[PDB]
Design a protein around this ligand. Structure first.
Ligand SMILES: [Mg+2]
Ligand SMILES: [Mg+2]
Length: 472
């Protein structure tokens, strides 16, 4: 039939897999073939829509329910087996663009996971529906290992991932890290194209500690390659105060960061101890800098933007320098904050975008600009644009855009902004616990005056970001 992976809708790092003939959803599936299935015409009925789910490694073995529990079992040729191993593929119960699997012999019951085990249950609640919805990733899906010089995406590229960091490495892959909705782990994925980030198999490369430091909220990881090694800069609270957040570093010298060993290097200390988050790094003219957000107890803002020179990838040196603090009304809706700095170099300037206001629909982006020949450690080299440079747009239906990163087309010729936003405005409850910020991308245009034009957040759907020009 058709080889496929079956990815969970609500745990999109997790896949239906053979676990020594038991059946569960897991991340980090090893061997990868445990998550590979062949969708074949239904054993009990080969009509349109009916399928059976066969193991690739164990041909003749299929997913079969018994007492509402799933096992991977050898087809015994009986009618009861065929019926217990046949499903109708129907529009996803939680989202009709995804897939749900309705039992052939129990048509009110669907394949679902609970406590990570695969079951066949009736589906009542909104959570039941999410547990019963899956993404089929098959040969028709974008292949993350295939190169393409054109950049065409379908937004949202990655649902339910916030603070998206995309890094184009010198192996022909983009690497993506992001905040996950539970804020409890660091997830990494790679693809040769931006659109393939949607279908790439992520890996959980690190999970939070059970006690003490690095045991609270895990926020906004960024992967960088510096001096021949991989680094992840991330923000982590403690187990007794999820918001007592500091910067931490992981290091991996193995060349493939999805298979390599990651080592904790500890806290990246700054000039004082307080809420510190959202670090990024850039190099210019032989100096490396850290740029991050931090609370100053003496200033009534949740965080300000700081820069400092680095002494290698693990430390700053000298004094940190505040280059932005929230002061315009648009930086203070809900609360006064500047966070999520991202660096873009062009046209003789260093541009740093940042996000401001609360993380609901009011979230937006501002811009800092310095001449690239100026003293970057002098606050007066940095100039804040007086208005937001990217914000909600009711006409495109995108709300609270921010915590962006910048990458390029594969050929390096154009800049592309990757960021999160919601496709609805009103949020119920604490916005930190609304998980529906989705990762998306669009071109960065350039004004004739040399400054970036971020435009408005594009509506959901297909966006042609870049087609490479051709010499006559
Ligand atoms: Mg089972
Ligand atoms: Mg960041």
């Amino acid at each position: 039939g058709a080889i496929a992976k079956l990815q969970s809708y609500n745990y999109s790092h997790m896949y239906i897999r053979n676990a020594n003939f038991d059946v569960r959803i897991d991340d980090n599936v090893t061997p990868e073939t445990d998550a590979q299935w062949v969708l074949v015409p239904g054993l009990a009925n080969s009509g349109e829509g009916y399928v059976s789910i066969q193991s690739v490694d164990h041909l003749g073995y299929y997913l079969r329910h018994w007492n509402y529990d799933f096992r991977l079992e050898k087809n015994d040729g009986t009618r009861i087996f065929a019926e217990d191993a046949t499903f109708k593929m129907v529009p996803g119960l939680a989202d009709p663009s995804y897939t749900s699997f309705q039992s052939y012999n129990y048509p009110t019951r669907y394949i679902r996971h609970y406590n990570y085990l695969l079951r066949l249950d009736e589906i009542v609640t909104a959570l039941d529906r999410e547990d019963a919805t899956f993404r089929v990733i098959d040969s028709s899906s974008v292949d993350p290992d295939k190169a393409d010089d054109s950049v065409i995406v379908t937004n949202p590229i990655v649902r339910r991932r916030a603070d998206p960091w995309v890094y184009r490495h010198t192996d022909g892959y983009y690497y993506m890290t992001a905040s996950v909705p539970e804020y409890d782990r660091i997830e990494l994925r790679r693809s040769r194209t931006l659109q393939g980030l949607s279908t790439a198999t992520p890996k959980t490369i690190w999970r939070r500690h059970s006690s003490g430091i690095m045991g609270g909220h895990i926020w906004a990881p960024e992967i960088h390659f510096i001096d021949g090694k991989w680094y992840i800069y991330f923000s982590a609270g403690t187990s007794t105060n999820y918001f007592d957040i500091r910067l931490y570093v992981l290091e991996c010298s193995d060349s493939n960061p999805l298979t390599g060993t990651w080592v904790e290097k500890g806290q990246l200390k700054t000039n004082w101890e307080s809420f510190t988050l959202d670090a990024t790094t850039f190099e210019h003219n032989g100096t490396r800098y850290l740029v991050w957000a931090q609370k100053d107890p003496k200033i009534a803002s949740n965080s300000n933007i700081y820069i400092a020179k680095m002494n290698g990838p693990l430390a700053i040196t000298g004094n940190q320098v505040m280059i932005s603090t929230p002061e315009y009304s648009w930086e203070k809706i809900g609360y006064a904050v500047n966070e999520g700095p991202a660096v873009l170099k062009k046209n003789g300037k260093i541009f740093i975008t940042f996000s401001a206001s609360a993380t609901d629909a009011n979230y937006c982006m501002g811009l800092l600009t310095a001449s690239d020949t100026a003293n970057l450690l002098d606050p007066k080299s940095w100039h804040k644009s007086p208005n937001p440079v990217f914000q909600s747009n009711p006409s495109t239906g995108q709300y609270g855009p921010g915590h962006n990163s910048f990458t390029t087309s594969p050929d390096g010729k154009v800049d592309i902004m990757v960021y999160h936003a919601r496709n609805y405005r009103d949020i119920t409850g604490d916005p930190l616990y609304d998980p529906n910020r989705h990762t998306r991308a669009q071109i960065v245009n350039w004004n004739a005056d040399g400054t970036p034009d971020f435009g408005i957040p594009v509506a959901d759907g297909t966006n042609v970001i870049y087609i490479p020009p051709q010499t006559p």
